[PDB]
């Protein structure tokens, strides 16, 4: 099954839309689960993501205008137990150990962060951590290296393929990292 992980859009605050090629890709009828890290911020962008898939799991992100989104969240999909959080909640913003702390407190196999606008994915003490980065590729004070990215997972079962979609230039350069339950 296909899990679309993204976030940090900041519409309209920091960016007027998603990059042409990304909107062109993300069509309805190819996704079952979405795990958005936030900063949508508007209803406009909630209603986009609800079109794309049946299941949709937002979190509360520092600039979100809706209150009703949940700060922290977890979901079991397949064999996997995933953790999801916008990531400003973790201090020091996007440190290692703080993101591991948050794993233990959650007891999750996968843990999605955000806020840095910078993609990462890696294995650390037999548990996985993701961050799709900016879908829009929006501003950030701390970084000026912004590569519009979103992630797709293929959880087969006891085996997750972690595709990362980046937009370098005007081409869509995709890499892949496979992780599997210990």
């Amino acid at each position: 099954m296909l899990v679309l992980v993204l976030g940090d859009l900041h519409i309209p605050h920091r960016c007027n839309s998603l990059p042409a090629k990304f909107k062109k890709l993300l069509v309805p009828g190819k996704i079952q689960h979405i795990l958005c890290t936030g900063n949508l911020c508007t209803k406009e962008s909630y209603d986009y993501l609800k079109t794309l898939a049946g299941d949709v799991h937002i979190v509360r992100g520092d600039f979100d205008e809706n209150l009703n989104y949940p700060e922290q969240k977890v979901v079991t999909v397949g064999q996997f137990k995933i953790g999801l959080i916008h990531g400003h909640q973790v201090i020091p913003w996007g440190d290692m150990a703080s993101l591991a702390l948050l794993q233990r407190q959650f007891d999750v196999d996968i843990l999605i962060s955000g806020h840095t606008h910078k993609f990462e994915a890696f294995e650390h003490e037999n548990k996985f951590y993701i961050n799709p980065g900016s879908a829009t590729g929006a501003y950030n004070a701390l970084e000026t290296n912004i590569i519009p990215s979103f992630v797709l997972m293929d959880i087969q079962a006891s085996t997750v393929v972690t595709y990362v979609y980046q937009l370098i230039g005007d081409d869509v350069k995709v890499e892949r990292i496979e992780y599997k339950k210990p």
């Binding site: 090629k21 890709l25 069509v27 190819k30 797709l152 595709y163 979609y165 995709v174 890499e175 892949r176």
Partner: protein, 217 residues
């Protein structure tokens, strides 16, 4: 002197042997080693290409010893060693049978070899998957259709992936299995399928197992 290159002979002699090996499974497993060796070894380097072929003399004499041989007596400055890594044994820049082309061939035969007695899921796969995709799949069925990975074949590249949302794993390794080459392979796939398909004229698990590789959304 000796002023005609063994290139064409060797090339042709593989096609002869591959034919024999379709039946003889002990010759097949023996041939695979030979093909793998040429593939792994680098036709950029001249000597090594000559080396690796000559090192398999024991195999080049199983079918046709006429490949390796030359009259070592009565020729000054064409001693036995000197010939086997010379331009005369195998011309580095033969306009037709370029070391490169023999490599590019070798692989073609490698895939065709393992094709011979591979299963129905395999054949069907090789037909559906497009030029780019088919190359990937050949890695994906390692090492049955041959060892194609970054270090076991010289010209082989890193597997790349599409923007299409379920992202298909592909390859753009044209410097081994050319779009031309791969088209031949498909041809031999459906040859091998069609030929197999006639010999059970009602039902059975081929026609269940075909329906499984075919209806796979």
């Amino acid at each position: 002197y000796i002023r005609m290159a063994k290139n064409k002979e060797f090339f042709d002699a593989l096609e002869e042997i591959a034919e024999s090996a379709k039946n003889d499974e002990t010759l097949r497993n023996e041939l695979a080693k030979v093909l793998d060796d040429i593939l792994k070894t680098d036709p950029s380097d001249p000597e090594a290409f000559r080396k690796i072929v000559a090192e398999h003399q024991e195999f080049w004499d199983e079918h046709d010893p006429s490949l390796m041989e030359f009259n070592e007596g009565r020729f000054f400055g064409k001693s036995r060693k000197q010939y086997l890594k010379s331009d005369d044994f195998l011309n580095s820049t033969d306009p037709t049978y370029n070391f490169q082309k023999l490599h590019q061939f070798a692989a073609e035969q490698r895939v065709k070899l393992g094709l011979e007695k591979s299963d129905t899921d395999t054949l069907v796969a090789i037909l559906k998957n497009n030029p780019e995709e088919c190359r990937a799949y050949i890695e994906s069925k390692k090492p049955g259709l041959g060892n194609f990975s970054e270090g076991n074949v010289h010209g082989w590249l890193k597997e790349e992936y599409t923007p299409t949302i379920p992202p298909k794993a592909i390859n753009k390794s044209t410097g081994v299995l050319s779009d031309e080459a791969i088209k031949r392979i498909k041809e031999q796939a459906r040859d091998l399928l069609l030929l197999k398909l006639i010999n059970s004229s009602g039902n059975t698990q081929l026609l269940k197992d075909l329906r499984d590789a075919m209806s796979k959304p």
